[PDB]
Amino acid sequence: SWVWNQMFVLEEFSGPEPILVGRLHTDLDPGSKKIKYILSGDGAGTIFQINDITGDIHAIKRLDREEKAEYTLTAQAVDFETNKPLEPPSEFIIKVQDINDNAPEFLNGPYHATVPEMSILGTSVTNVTATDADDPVYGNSAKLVYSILEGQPYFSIEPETAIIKTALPNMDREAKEEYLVVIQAKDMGGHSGGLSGTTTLTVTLTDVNDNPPKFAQSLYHFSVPEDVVLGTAIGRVKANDQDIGENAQSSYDIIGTALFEITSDAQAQDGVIRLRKPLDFETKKSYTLKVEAANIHIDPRFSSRGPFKDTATVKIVVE
Amino acid sequence: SWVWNQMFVLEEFSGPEPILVGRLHTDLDPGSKKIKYILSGDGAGTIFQINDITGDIHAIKRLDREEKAEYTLTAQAVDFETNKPLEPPSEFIIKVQDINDNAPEFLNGPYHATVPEMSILGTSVTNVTATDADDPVYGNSAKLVYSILEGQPYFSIEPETAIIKTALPNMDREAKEEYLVVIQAKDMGGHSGGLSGTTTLTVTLTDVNDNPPKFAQSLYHFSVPEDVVLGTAIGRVKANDQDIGENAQSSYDIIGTALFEITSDAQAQDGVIRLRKPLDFETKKSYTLKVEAANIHIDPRFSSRGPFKDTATVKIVVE
Numbered sequence: 283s284w285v286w287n288q289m290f291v292l293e294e295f296s297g298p299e300p301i302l303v304g305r306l307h308t309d310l311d312p313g314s315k316k317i318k319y320i321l322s323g324d325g326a327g328t329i330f331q332i333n334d335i336t337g338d339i340h341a342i343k344r345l346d347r348e349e350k351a352e353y354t355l356t357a358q359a360v361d362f363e364t365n366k367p368l369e370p371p372s373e374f375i376i377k378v379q380d381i382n383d384n385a386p387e388f389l390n391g392p393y394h395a396t397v398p399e400m401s402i403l404g405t406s407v408t409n410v411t412a413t414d415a416d417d418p419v420y421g422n423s424a425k426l427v428y429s430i431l432e433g434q435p436y437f438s439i440e441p442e443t444a445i446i447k448t449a450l451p452n453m454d455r456e457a458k459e460e461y462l463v464v465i466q467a468k469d470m471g472g473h474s475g476g477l478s479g480t481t482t483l484t485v486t487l488t489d490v491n492d493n494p495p496k497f498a499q500s501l502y503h504f505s506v507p508e509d510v511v512l513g514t515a516i517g518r519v520k521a522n523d524q525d526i527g528e529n530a531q532s533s534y535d536i537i538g539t540a541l542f543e544i545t546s547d548a549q550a551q552d553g554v555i556r557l558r559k560p561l562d563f564e565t566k567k568s569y570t571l572k573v574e575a576a577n578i579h580i581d582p583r584f585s586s587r588g589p590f591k592d593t594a595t596v597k598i599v600v601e
Numbered sequence: 602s603w604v605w606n607q608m609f610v611l612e613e614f615s616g617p618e619p620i621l622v623g624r625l626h627t628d629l630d631p632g633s634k635k636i637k638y639i640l641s642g643d644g645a646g647t648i649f650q651i652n653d654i655t656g657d658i659h660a661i662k663r664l665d666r667e668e669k670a671e672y673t674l675t676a677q678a679v680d681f682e683t684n685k686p687l688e689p690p691s692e693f694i695i696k697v698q699d700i701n702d703n704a705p706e707f708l709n710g711p712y713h714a715t716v717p718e719m720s721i722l723g724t725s726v727t728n729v730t731a732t733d734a735d736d737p738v739y740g741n742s743a744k745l746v747y748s749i750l751e752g753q754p755y756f757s758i759e760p761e762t763a764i765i766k767t768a769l770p771n772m773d774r775e776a777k778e779e780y781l782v783v784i785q786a787k788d789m790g791g792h793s794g795g796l797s798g799t800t801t802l803t804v805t806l807t808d809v810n811d812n813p814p815k816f817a818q819s820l821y822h823f824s825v826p827e828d829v830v831l832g833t834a835i836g837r838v839k840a841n842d843q844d845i846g847e848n849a850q851s852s853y854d855i856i857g858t859a860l861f862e863i864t865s866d867a868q869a870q871d872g873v874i875r876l877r878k879p880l881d882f883e884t885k886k887s888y889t890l891k892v893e894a895a896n897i898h899i900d901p902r903f904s905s906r907g908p909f910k911d912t913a914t915v916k917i918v919v920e
């Protein structure tokens with residue numbers, strides 16, 4: 283069925299002076315009688331106002347589509363004096379059409395997203411998705427095109443879908459952990475006179491174990507009174523696998539001992555030495571330990587290639 | 602019956618970029634099939650061109666109402682691939698609306714009109730009627746208002762109907778016979794930014810007999826050889842009723858004569874004297890005539906009040 287009951291009013295402008303959108307009509311003959319038009323419905327006589335006899339309807343108000351895009355209305359046909367219906371009323375809509383006064387706009391102010399450290403160039407990161415208020419049905423009033431406006435240890439915003447990718451080969455965090463990129467979107471765009479919506483994106487990377495652990499220095503020295511019939515502990519040597527977290531927690535043990543325990547630890551990841559067997563002898567004054575400390579998992583937690591796991595020597599002297 | 606098949610396109614402008622006038626429609630459901638719109642008719646695809654799928658029709662040409670105000674057109678509904686009619690075609694008109702680019706304009710360049718000399722203030726003279734090209738159906742695009750722009754031994758152009766009247770009491774031509782007045786007409790007008798059409802009008806008056814006739818001078822002299830056994834004629838005395846034409850033609854006769862005819866005349870309106878009786882005598886040397894000469898008709902042709910009809914004396918001497 284053909285639709286013909288619709289009028290299109292361009293929104294907001296006219297400034298002052300008013301614009302007709304449609305003159306109505308019922309056909310019929312003359313013959314010494316006449317039709318006077320009366321209009322009723324939405325914002326009747328106030329927004330849209332009718333010149334009676336003719337059928338002329340100008341808008342006498344700024345129209346905002348985003349407020350309300352359609353206005354179901356009902357105008358009439360009666361004689362002037364008779365007022366008897368010279369045509370039973372019709373229902374019909376008036377539409378706007380939306381002009382690009384409405385901006386591109388992001389839902390949250392800043393955004394924060396994470397991505398696995400060293401991973402092949404172009405790895406998915408997140409979608410940023412703005413929003414234009416306008417008409418997504420006609421023209422380029424809304425069609426948006428995203429772009430990385432800045433963020434140059436590099437990611438790519440894939441322009442159609444806005445999805446962020448990385449733009450960089452590997453990306454060893456130990457260099458830089460957090461990343462700032464500023465995001466755009468053009469109304470039309472591909473065409474200037476476009477609109478401009480920006481957002482902050484805090485990008486951080488995760489970890490991997492691309493680090494063996496460290497020892498403060500290669501040769502340690504300590505000292506001790508010769509029995510302590512309690513415990514006890516003597517010294518602390520440290521590892522620092524820069525690769526944080528679980529990827530940092532390292533395992534100590536000694537590989538010139540046996541009078542000495544060595545202890546965990548999730549304390550700072552040291553490093554402590556208890557005296558196991560008590561003590562007795564001058565027979566020794568000097569003692570020696572070599573100590574392996576290494577990162578962990580339940581399957582190979584060095585899935586790359588790691589060289590040292592820092593050994594190192596401890597010299598304990600007697601008193 | 603309600604009319605809804607009509608669209609309104611404002612004429613001539615857009616300059617470049619195009620303006621939609623109406624998106625079409627047939628209702629129906631989706632369900633994995635679709636409507637593609639094809640348009641055909643007047644200046645189809647060339648003046649008015651169709652965005653197929655949507656129903657959008659912008660004009661891609663200056664439109665001139667005065668060239669053609671309406672365009673009967675026929676657009677369609679078929680599927681894209683199927684091309685089978687998803688709706689039997691509709692006939693509908695597109696209308697313009699006319700904007701005031703068209704000027705007020707008079708049919709002939711100059712105009713020439715006549716009116717009876719002394720006649721009560723405000724006597725009808727003629728209609729001047731211009732012509733605006735525009736729309737006489739909507740707004741003040743055409744409603745015209747005439748004015749005497751100049752012509753100040755005065756006439757009035759009655760502004761609604763343009764009819765010229767005299768603006769002056771009596772108006773004795775003998776003062777001035779022809780009159781120049783320049784005529785105007787404003788498009789809208791009563792409202793500036795109106796349009797401006799001017800015309801020349803040569804006004805002349807007719808006559809009445811508001812003049813007695815004249816004699817060159819009050820005393821005439823002539824002379825004559827004493828017999829002429831032929832005719833003959835002697836002298837000519839003149840009248841000049843300034844009131845021209847029939848109102849000037851005057852009647853001579855003598856009211857010390859009898860040897861002398863006096864003759865008409867539509868010669869210059871004199872004035873001639875024939876000798877009736879021949880001649881004989883020294884017995885007279887000096888002769889005398891008094892002469893009435895007067896304007897004419899078959900009922901009172903001095904329907905005002907006229908004093909002299911200039912008498913006057915002629916002295917003929919003998920030789």
Ligand SMILES: [Ca+2]
Nearest residue numbers: 346347348383
């Ligand atoms: Ca708006």
Ligand SMILES: [Ca+2]
Nearest residue numbers: 380381383384
């Ligand atoms: Ca808008």
Ligand SMILES: [Ca+2]
Nearest residue numbers: 384385414416
């Ligand atoms: Ca917009």
Ligand SMILES: [Ca+2]
Nearest residue numbers: 489490492525
């Ligand atoms: Ca790492």
Ligand SMILES: [Ca+2]
Nearest residue numbers: 493523525529
């Ligand atoms: Ca590590």
Ligand SMILES: [Ca+2]
Nearest residue numbers: 455456489525
């Ligand atoms: Ca790392």
Ligand SMILES: [Ca+2]
Nearest residue numbers: 665666667702
């Ligand atoms: Ca025109």
Ligand SMILES: [Ca+2]
Nearest residue numbers: 699700702703
């Ligand atoms: Ca025009």
Ligand SMILES: [Ca+2]
Nearest residue numbers: 703704733735
């Ligand atoms: Ca005009």
Ligand SMILES: [Ca+2]
Nearest residue numbers: 808809811844
């Ligand atoms: Ca006269």
Ligand SMILES: [Ca+2]
Nearest residue numbers: 812842844848
């Ligand atoms: Ca006269």
Ligand SMILES: [Ca+2]
Nearest residue numbers: 774775808844
């Ligand atoms: Ca006269």
